[PDB]
Amino acid sequence: IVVREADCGTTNYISVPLFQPDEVTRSLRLRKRADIEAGLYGRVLAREVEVLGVRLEEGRYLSMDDVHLLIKAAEAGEIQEVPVRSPLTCQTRYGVCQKCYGYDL
Ligand SMILES: [Zn+2]
Numbered sequence: 001i002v003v004r005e006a007d008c009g010t011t012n013y014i015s016v017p018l019f020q021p022d023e024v025t026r027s028l029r030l031r032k033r034a035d036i037e038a039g040l041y042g043r044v045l046a047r048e049v050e051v052l053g054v055r056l057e058e059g060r061y062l063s064m065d066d067v068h069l070l071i072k073a074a075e076a077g078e079i080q081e082v083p084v085r086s087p088l089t090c091q092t093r094y095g096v097c098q099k100c101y102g103y104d105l
Contacts (some may be wrong), residue, residue, distance in 0.1 A: 001087075005097030007059075012089040015081035018074040030074055039082075040067040042103020046083040052076065061103055066089030 012028065016039040019028045030036075043063055051073040062084075073079055075096040090100040 002095050002096045003101055005092055007099045008091045008097035010089070010091035011085070013083055014086045014088055015083055016040050016043075017081055018071065019029065019080055029088065030071065033071065036071055037064065037067055040084060044085040044099040044102060046085050049079065049083065051078050059099060063103075088103055 016036075016087045018031055018036060020031055021028075023029065040062055042061055045056055045060050045062060049056045049070075052069060054069070056062065058089055060066075062070070070079065070082060085100045085102075087100055090096050092100075
């Protein structure tokens with residue numbers, strides 16, 4: 001597996017959950033500031049999301065500052081999932097692309 005690309009054109013994406021079904025039977029709650037971070041830090045937005053006032057555009061890499069906004073938004077109740085590129089859905093057979101990997105070099 002190696003990053004060798006051009007933005008892989010296949011946009012099939014994963015949606016990262018901000019809520020979990022069962023610590024206590026059923027009660028929706030905001031995931032931890034950590035796990036959520038793990039899921040969306042420096043990722044590439046598959047589709048555009050308008051949340052608290054700002055228009056996170058498509059393909060934008062979300063900084064930790066941005067993944068700090070989305071939670072602040074899920075706190076308010078504006079989003080329950082997040083559209084985002086990922087290696088699980090890449091088209092580059094042997095390899096992964098810039099937009100699907102993300103930030104973290
Ligand atoms: Zn890709």
